[PDB]
Amino acid sequence: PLGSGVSFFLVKEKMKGKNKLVPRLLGITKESVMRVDEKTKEVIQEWSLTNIKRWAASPKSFTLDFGDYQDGYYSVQTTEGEQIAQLIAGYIDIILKKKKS
């Protein structure tokens, strides 16, 4: 099985209709980012690292921007915005160095 060293971050996702935040687990790897349900412990939706166009990291909230994949934008309350942002940047650099065009 593939999965020895997955970076998991505790973030809060806002619900639709009710203005509240719920704790959710997000798995970030060197290939793609997947969202795991805290209750069922299963991957709901995931996006590729190379598909990410841009990202904004705030002190209390992280923002993601996908090119031609997500209609809207993924924005949730993150406890470690700097840690997540740095991790994503590093993964992109490794791929570029290995597969350069």
């Binding site: 806002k14 203005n19 509240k20 935040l21 190379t50 990410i52 166009k53 841009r54 990202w55 904004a56 990291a57 705030s58 002190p59 209390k60 909230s61 923002t63 921007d65 090119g67 924005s75 309350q77 942002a85 940047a89 992109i92 650099d93 791929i95 570029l96 065009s101």
Partner: protein, 34 residues
């Protein structure tokens, strides 16, 4: 009954408020120019 007072409004507001005040970062994969 339970009434939210200075907690949910502050938490959600700051959350949102910060989104607009966040710096964007592009990846080299898209920008391949010198």
């Amino acid at each position: 009954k339970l009434l939210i007072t200075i907690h949910d409004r502050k938490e959600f507001a700051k959350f949102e408020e910060e989104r607009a005040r966040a710096k964007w970062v592009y990846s080299p994969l898209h920008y391949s120019a010198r």
